[PDB]
Structures are given as structure tokens and as C-alpha cells.
Design a protein around this ligand. Sequence first.
Ligand SMILES: OC[C@H]1O[C@H](O[C@H]2[C@H](O)[C@@H](O)[C@@H](O[C@H]3[C@H](O)[C@@H](O)[C@@H](O)O[C@@H]3CO)O[C@@H]2CO)[C@H](O)[C@@H](O)[C@@H]1O
Length: 370
Amino acid sequence: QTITVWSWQTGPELQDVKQIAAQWAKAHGDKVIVVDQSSNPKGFQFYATAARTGKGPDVVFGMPHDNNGVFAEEGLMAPVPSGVLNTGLYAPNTIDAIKVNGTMYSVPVSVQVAAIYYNKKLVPQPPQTWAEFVKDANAHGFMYDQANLYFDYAIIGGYGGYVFKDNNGTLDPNNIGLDTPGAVQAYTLMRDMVSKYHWMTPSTNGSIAKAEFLAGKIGMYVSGPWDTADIEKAKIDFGVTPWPTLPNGKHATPFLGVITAFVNKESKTQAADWSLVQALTSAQAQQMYFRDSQQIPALLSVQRSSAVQSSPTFKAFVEQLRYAVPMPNIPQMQAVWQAMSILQNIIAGKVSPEQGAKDFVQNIQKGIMA
Ligand SMILES: OC[C@H]1O[C@H](O[C@H]2[C@H](O)[C@@H](O)[C@@H](O[C@H]3[C@H](O)[C@@H](O)[C@@H](O)O[C@@H]3CO)O[C@@H]2CO)[C@H](O)[C@@H](O)[C@@H]1O
């Protein structure tokens, strides 16, 4: 009798999802319960853990697109019905992000590109070049989730590295670019931010950086709209700006992430499920999510709205979009996330950038047991 939605988005966006769900239930009669999985210890892949034993939700809301390759390969996702998605209403990369083996398996709700969040009280105007960045980082501090590939990939790609080679829109899982000479240069810079610039210590991570930023102790840190609520609560007069150009004069290449919503193949109420997904991902819903969290809408028409076009978050997004690399969504991407722990070793100076890079790729190539 009840439709269960698992949401990986929390805070104000979760409140909006609950509101929309309640309105939907009011018209349809079907009861709806929205569960917050954002802090679940098993992470995003918890959907697979649950669905593999037939204990998953009816609908999933707020799932980063890279995770869906696993879910789709295992047959845990209902293909999107014909006509539900109008590809012309999104940027090309946005729709490609929700396709697995050429089939659309989820609906785009938001698009994300990590950026530098800065404290205007400490840094009035944001740095754009590495030189300017060093000056501001030295003067007021800089920290981020340095050992997390999702964020530090911006540096890797900036030096020519890549995860899986993209050719003709298709990714080659065997052609990895995380150990190229360019990637090694990037890892060297990551280590340098600790050993040379002293902006961070080997223990610095995302949690610590966020805490320091909310306390007004550092002027810059790398984040996204998921922190909007907490930043405003801390009363930080924050700004958003693109990653600065790197020491090699090139632009950093942060990942492009697409937040998606989808239906469990095992759900007994597929038609109702897609109707609920439509309500949770409509232009109106996206307008709400933006107003309350600054999450950039996946729909181009909402991106072109006055509220979005005038925002600092969108300005940074549009400035980085051309350099953003969509996260791979093939199953092998999980092997990459699972082997990135070696980045910490490089940043701590326990292993050289060259050796660490080599082992990183070798570990990825071991793959994941089916
Ligand atoms: O680190 C490995 C991890 O990288 C990618 O995850 C990023 C998310 O795509 C991105 O949205 C953001 O996650 C935030 C949630 O969306 C938000 O609701 C709330 O829970 O805070 C999160 C920040 O901790 O950042 C993560 C990276 O930390 C990739 O999509 C994952 O599959 C992968 O495991």
C-alpha cells in the first residue's frame, strides 16, 4: 500500500522531496514514505546491497549517475519507459550519463560540478590563476577532500590524465590514464600542497576542511551545493568560483555529476512509481531544489530561468562545464573508487608519485569479482 522512496539527498532538498511526495500521495491515494540514506554506512552502493536480496525501495531519488552502471548491469533498474525522457531538454552529456549500454535507466534531476567555495570576509574577490590562488591560500587557508579522487581528479585531468579513454562517446575500460606522465605530475602537486605549500597535512580530509570553513578559519575549500545549507547556517558570506588554473597554466577538470532518480525493477507498482518520479523531477521540482539548495537543474529550461542565470553557483558551473568530465558510469568505475585509497599514501609521502600511480592503475586493473 505504501511506495517507498530512498533519497541520498538530505537537508532542505529532502524536505522538498517529502513535500512533493505528500502532494503526489494526496492526489493518487498511494501512501509514500521517503527514507534518508545519505548517511548510510554502505554508501550509494547500498541500493545494490539491498536490491540483490529483494529488499530495495520502489524508487530511488538523488543517486549520482556513476553508480547506475552497477545497478543496471545486475538488472536492478527498470528501463525508463519510451517518451518519459525528451533528450532535447537536456545537455547531451546529461542524457549520456543516464544511459547504460545504450539504454536509458534513470531520469536526470540535477547536474553538479565541484567548485571553490570562498569566504568573502577573508577573500573579497576570488582567485582565478594559480599565482592568485597561492596568494589567497597562503593568506587565509585552503583545505579540501584531497585524497578523494572525485575532487582531486580536477588536478589529474588538468595535467592530461583521465580515468577511461573516451572515444566516439564510448569508454575503453582497459585504456586507463591515471598513471600517465601527466597524472604523475598531478600526484606530485597533490603531495606538494602538503610538503611544499603546507596548506594541508596528510590527515586533512573533506570533513576537516568543511569544519574549518564553517568556523571561518579557512578562506577556501572545494565543495558543492550539498553544503549550501550548512554554509548559510554558519552565517558565512560565501561565494562560489571555478577551480583556479593550475601551475601548468591549464584549467582544472572537475567531474560532471548527474543526480538521478529511478525505479526498482522489482517494484510492484511501476506505473505509479514513474508518476512519482515525474513529480520529483519536474521543472517545478527542480526550481524548488535550486531555490532551497542551489542545486543546478538538469533541465535546460530551468537553467535558463532568471533565478538560475543570476546565481553565483550557476556562474561557476557554466564557467567550468566545458572542462568538466562526466563521471564514467560503467561498473569498472567502482574499482577506481575502491582503489583510490592509495592517493592518501602519495599525499602522505609514504609512496612516490610515480610508484603510487603505477600501483593505483594496477590495482584498478585487478577489477572487482563479479
Ligand atoms: O568519493 C567517491 C564517490 O565520488 C562520487 O560521489 C560524490 C557525489 O557524486 C557528490 O554528489 C557528493 O555527494 C554528496 C551527496 O550527493 C549529498 O547528498 C550529501 O550526502 O553529501 C555528499 C558529500 O559527502 O560528493 C561525493 C564524493 O564524496 C561518486 O558519485 C560516488 O559514487 C563515489 O563513491
